[PDB]
């Protein structure tokens, strides 16, 4: 009905991103705004494969380093002031929350 | 309204029986439409014996790097082979194939210490018969005008008759002769 | 192989000793009891404990079991 | 093509001082001529109006003359300049298509010119070595 605001929550920590998403949802439910639903975007895995040795001797063994990225989005039809009030709380370290207005 | 399968919708499986009293439980006469089932036949020790015999022939045709994994091609070659077998024998090509497999392997071999004559298990007889017939047909068509289905048909028919013109029969006679000499 | 390690066997013996009256010959009900009466990270370990716990109960009905002391 | 063998069939056909097998199909018998590949032979057949399905042994003298004429002067028969094996001669600056012994002679001329100017490629040819920058170590091994 009104303008739509998009909350993008991204983090390297699965526990942190889930807790922030739940806190945002609970605060939105307290404010009685119409939220669409927290959508879990596909998890992205940054993979780096390197040779274990620093000199190049012996059996050619490798190290597979992986970094996983979790992303969530929440859509709610609330005035920018209300979304600022909902977003205004203490988040965990390493969690990024972005504000986007849908057109 | 459910009818029995016929291989390539042309050849009937009714009465398909091996004349050999042995190999009866190791040659599968289950009806099928095509020699292509994505079954896990190698999971158990003797599960491969239950696989349909024509599909086993199709797998035997999938040798060498240029033939590895071409099962649709093997099915097409077998379809033409069965048509040629019917024209040559005026008999059910499924029965001709069954007879060729039943007679295509030696019953006695030599092993081992000195060489000693031993019997051959029925599973190996079926396995070797398919292996040698495919080997003979493949090597015959290597640099020859005659196509592979024609070479395969001639090998199967000669093996079914027990003729020495078959590559598998020739090897079977040599192995049995050596095994007899090693008694 | 499927040999139960001493961790599973010791835990199963303790579970039978402490909760004999609540157990029976069914793995699934025995497992449900074990989730509540035991603390462990491994679901696989709890399932293994339940399996041997059922085995101990079956042996107990036939006769005494060494290492199982039911007061 | 179910056509009976003609009385004038030749198993060996003379074309540009080259023995051409009359058993082969027309484009794949023209490629036996030095300077004419599979692509060039198909274009020669197209410009000569000869059905490519025919065997080369059935070619008459007039068609052989037309084929020789087209191979000699492809540009006259509307063959594009990018289709010719010598588009701008380093000595003459002319576009032409070498054929038969002309290819070998011009290759000898090119080697002589490079070895006369003492260029690096000429020195490599004189020493019988690879000229295109390939690693000759662990390569060739006659």
């Amino acid at each position: 009905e009104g303008q739509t605001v998009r909350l993008t929550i991204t983090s390297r920590n699965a526990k942190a991103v889930e807790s922030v998403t739940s806190q945002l949802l609970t605060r939105a439910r307290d404010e009685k705004v119409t939220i669409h639903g927290p959508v879990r975007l596909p998890t992205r895995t940054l993979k780096i494969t390197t040779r274990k040795t620093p000199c190049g001797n012996g059996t050619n063994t490798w190290d597979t380093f992986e970094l996983k990225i979790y992303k969530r989005i929440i859509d709610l039809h609330a005035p920018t002031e209300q979304v600022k009030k909902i977003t205004s709380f203490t988040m965990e370290s390493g969690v990024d929350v972005s504000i986007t207005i849908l057109d | 309204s459910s009818k029995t399968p016929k291989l390539f919708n042309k050849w009937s499986f009714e009465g398909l029986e091996t004349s050999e009293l042995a190999l009866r439980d190791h040659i599968s006469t289950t009806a099928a439409y095509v020699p292509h089932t994505s079954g896990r036949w190698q999971k158990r020790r003797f599960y491969k014996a239950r696989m349909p015999i024509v599909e086993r022939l199709a797998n035997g045709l999938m040798f060498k790097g240029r033939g590895n994994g071409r099962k649709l091609q093997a099915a097409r070659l077998l379809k033409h082979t069965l048509e040629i077998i019917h024209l040559l024998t005026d008999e059910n090509p499924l029965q001709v194939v069954v007879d060729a497999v039943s007679k295509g392997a030696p019953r006695e071999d030599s092993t081992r210490v000195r060489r000693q004559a031993v019997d051959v298990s029925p599973m190996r007889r079926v396995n070797e018969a398919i292996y040698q017939m495919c080997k003979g047909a493949r090597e015959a068509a290597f640099r020859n005008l005659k196509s592979m289905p024609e070479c395969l048909a001639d090998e199967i028919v000669n093996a079914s008759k027990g003729s020495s013109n078959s590559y598998a029969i020739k090897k079977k006679d040599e192995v049995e002769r050596v095994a007899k000499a090693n008694r | 192989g499927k040999i139960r390690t001493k961790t599973v066997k010791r835990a199963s013996r303790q579970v039978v000793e402490k909760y004999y009256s609540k157990l029976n010959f069914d793995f699934y009900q025995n497992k449900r009891v074990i989730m509540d009466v035991t603390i462990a990270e491994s679901k696989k370990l709890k399932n293994k404990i339940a399996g041997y716990t059922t085995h101990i109960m079956k042996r107990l009905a036939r006769g005494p079991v060494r290492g199982i002391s039911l007061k | 093509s179910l056509t009976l063998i003609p009385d004038h069939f030749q198993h060996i056909v003379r074309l540009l001082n080259t023995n051409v097998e009359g058993k082969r199909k027309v484009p794949f018998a023209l490629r036996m001529v030095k300077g004419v590949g599979i692509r060039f032979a198909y274009l020669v057949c197209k410009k000569a109006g000869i059905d490519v399905e025919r065997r080369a042994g059935t070619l008459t003298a007039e068609e052989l003359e037309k084929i020789a004429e087209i191979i000699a002067d492809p540009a006259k028969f509307k063959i594009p300049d990018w289709f010719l094996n010598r588009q701008r001669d380093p000595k003459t600056g002319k576009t032409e298509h070498l054929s038969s012994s002309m290819v070998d002679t011009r290759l000898r001329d090119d080697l002589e010119r490079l070895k006369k100017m003492r260029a690096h490629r000429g020195v490599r040819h004189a020493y019988g070595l690879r000229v295109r920058g390939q690693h000759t170590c662990t390569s060739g091994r006659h």
Binding site: - | L23, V120, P122, R183 | - | -
Partner: protein, 66 residues
């Protein structure tokens, strides 16, 4: 020519490399035949198991127990 026999017991893999199986074979003949229910020990090449069937040809030689 060849006499059919039934493998009633697998005695065990024999010989170096374990490729030969020693089995007990009952000759399959009609009642009253001289070979009726005659059991002999044989050495088998290839994968075999109990209740398999063998074509023995000669039925006189007996495999040495191992």
């Amino acid at each position: 020519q060849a006499q059919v026999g039934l493998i009633i017991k697998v005695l065990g893999r024999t010989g170096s490399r374990g490729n030969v199986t020693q089995v007990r074979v009952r000759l399959m003949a009609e009642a009253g035949s001289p070979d009726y229910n005659r059991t002999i020990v044989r050495n088998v090449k290839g994968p075999c198991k109990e209740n398999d069937m063998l074509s023995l040809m000669e039925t006189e030689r007996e495999a040495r127990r191992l």
